[PDB]
Amino acid sequence: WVDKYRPKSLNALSHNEELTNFLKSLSDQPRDLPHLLLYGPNGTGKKTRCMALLESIFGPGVYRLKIDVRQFVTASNRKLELNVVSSPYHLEITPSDMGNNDRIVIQELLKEVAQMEHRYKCVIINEANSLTKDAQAALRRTMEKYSKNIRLIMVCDSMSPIIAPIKSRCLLIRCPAPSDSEISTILSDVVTNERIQLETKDILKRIAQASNGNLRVSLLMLESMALNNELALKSSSPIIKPDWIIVIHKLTRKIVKERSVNSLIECRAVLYDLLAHCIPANIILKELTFSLLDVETLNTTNKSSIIEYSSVFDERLSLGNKAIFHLEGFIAKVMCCL
Amino acid sequence: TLSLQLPWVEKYRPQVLSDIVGNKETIDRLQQIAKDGNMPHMIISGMPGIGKTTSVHCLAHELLGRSYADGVLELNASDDRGIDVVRNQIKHFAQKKLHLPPGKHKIVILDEADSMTAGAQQALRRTMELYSNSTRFAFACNQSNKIIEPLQSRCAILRYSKLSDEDVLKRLLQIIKLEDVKYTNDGLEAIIFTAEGDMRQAINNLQSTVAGHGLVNADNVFKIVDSPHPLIVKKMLLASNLEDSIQILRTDLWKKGYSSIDIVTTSFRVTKNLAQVKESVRLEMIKEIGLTHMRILEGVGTYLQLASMLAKIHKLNNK
């Protein structure tokens, strides 16, 4: 399992040695530490490295944490309900659990934590990409006014939606996805500790080649296919793909097979069924476009138009709120292109 | 200075239904109603400054005679007209006992009926239905769609239209004869052109020109009351060459102090109401006028944005 075998310190990391050394350098002197922003691909291990860095800045009790609840009142008595992950040395907030009320929670909670205060209390903002521009503007001055009591460690997957002032107000640390060799070495230790039977080691490499640098996905897929092969992986064990990926692949097959309005209706139905089951539309568009480019029936002229339309409708979706209104438009434009 | 004089819109405000130069059909209808009596519930809709409030005031006055003070209940948008007022005061007035001639009824005048809340309008239904034999309701609004259909079902509907050139010219000639003002044909033509079927605005511009220069001439009217804003915008959009439209926008609109928001919004109205060009090109021009609006509402409102909007409109018109 991903959680049973996870590093708890900086000396327990097993990939990106230069990043581990940079983290040790940054944690050598912990009091004169500026705000940090960890950016990189999703599933690389930045959330583990931030906790490992906190384990170097503070005692080992940083992992012994608790979940509490805090209520907030907007203009309405509506009591925005937000759960907080707290520790005797740091606290974690995820403003991605609500709508446009990120600014209120951010400002009020951070001001309460900064007024109450090694000597400072660390703050981990999870998924900073979902932070609205108004919440980021509110945090802009809170980052600078209280710099001796509150230090921010913002974990995100892409600095594209992060505003320039916030980018300047904190150090930027990139976490490149681990190489397939390091993923294979980690899976080897996992299968020798979990007592899995490998007929040939190369299958582990293939797992990496099916994960695209994602370790969280790699270990989960390895464990999922270890339950289908009954704890004994053979030389030709099938690759376990998530359900939504299969739905997207079938959608692309339907797209390249039939291009009409009658097929556009069932495409809209598939998009609705995908969106209704807690699947973001940006990831849907990304996977749909990337798997449509893989269609060998199309030519360069079709793929260029497809990628242009996907960029245009990605901008539309980032500027809109009704995601299906942009997804169906992109699908119709792709149908018109082919 | 110690005191002012009454404006010509208020001084020469018609007090008899014959002095109204509005829509002849509805005017004769209301005149015959006041002559015979039995005034029904009515809703008068139209545009500002065409003789809606004056019409109902004249009707109520002629119908009630001296009992206007104790038989007419006036409620404007300046007074509270919520559910509580309709429940208490309007109902007390409708239930009030009053000895009237056998052809008259108590009149409840409600100015700006399009601003009353939904609750008050809903409560007014049975209020006007149970006392429809001793109390009558006259609504005066600008948008009949703002009044609920149940209220419109219990009353007559009088839609007032714009005043043609002849009627406003006749009224202005009557006012000039009554005031002994020096005028000229081109000056009155410019006044009527800048009025756009608005009698109140026409009389106001006439009085302002008289008190500012004395002689009602087209030069004076144009120097005091700038030409209609929408017409210059229409001439700018209907330009055939880009340089002509750019020069028009620069000299007529930008060099005279017209804000970019007014230019783009007036521009939208002109286009929506345009009829010279087809539907698709009009929709494309409206689309382009929109991006410029979004950019100006975001604070990027400058001359370059309007120039780019005009360039895109011309490119759309460039086949």
Binding site: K24, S25, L26, D28, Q29, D32, L33, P34, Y39, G40, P41, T44, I106, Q107, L110, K111, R119, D134, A137, A138, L139, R140, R141, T142, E144, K145, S147, K148, S158, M159, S160, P161, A164, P165, S168, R169, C170, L171, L172, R174, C175, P176, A177, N212, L285, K286, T289, L293, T300, K303, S304, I307, E308, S311, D314, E315, S318 | E298, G299, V300
Partner: protein, 340 residues
Amino acid sequence: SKLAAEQSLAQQPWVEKYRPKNLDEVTAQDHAVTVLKKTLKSANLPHMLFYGPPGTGKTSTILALTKELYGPDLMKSRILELNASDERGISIVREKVKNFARLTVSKPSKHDLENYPCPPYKIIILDEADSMTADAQSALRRTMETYSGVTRFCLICNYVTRIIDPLASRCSKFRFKALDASNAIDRLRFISEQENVKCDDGVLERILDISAGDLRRGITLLQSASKGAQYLGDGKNITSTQVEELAGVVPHDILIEIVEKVKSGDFDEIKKYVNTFMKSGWSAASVVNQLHEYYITNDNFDTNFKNQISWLLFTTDSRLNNGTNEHIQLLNLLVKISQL
């Protein structure tokens, strides 16, 4: 008292440790601080509107000005600082700001008038005015127009277009210039000498070159490089390569590989290389900036190609500035520039 403040500053990151306390610490924004120093002897401070790129020193300049004006005693009694972390609707602007403006100035003490000018007005600053709605901004118009005798308004923003035209007309516009290597090398060298940052010849000038007119990011990069060089303990000097490694800059060889894949290669090879490159975490904005620098600077492409590459890079940056997916935008940009 003062010693606790000195120790807290010494245990503070270099961004807040070296914050300008006086109007003389401002290194490059001289045109504004000259007027601010001249009006310090007079008493006709007008309403001001600071605007410019982030990290140019607007907040630091106004803080230093308010300090030099009022002293550390009246610093907390004659100042109304409203940031973006507070509510700034119509209700707040009408009640709190107007009540503070209508109030009279607090009496200065005997020690205040002996060392500081103590002007007869107070200062209400509104930091990050971009988030203020236009109606709440128009509400400030007569508030700042009629009570100018007792209070002075200082707006601070990054985009001057977000503030309505009447407010921009009422206030004196102060544009803060980008802090490139030329006008900030002195400040960067001072910060390096005060911290014993042993670097090479072309490091500091390079740091600001990566900063692109941002002294805060440059100071943060210098602090990170100093920490990374002190952890090693080798006693050597910081190199430009070590600086550009932690600054998020793509190495030159990886960029040359992208140029080769764009010049020679089809859609499939370019897509595969982009998928491989997105595995290593790089900011798409930095990649676009480096590609723009390389393509515009290289004297080996046609002008017709240069117009198209410039427009494509502009469109890609404008799309990336809206929170889009970096992978899709980068792939689309590389594909569009490969068809050229």
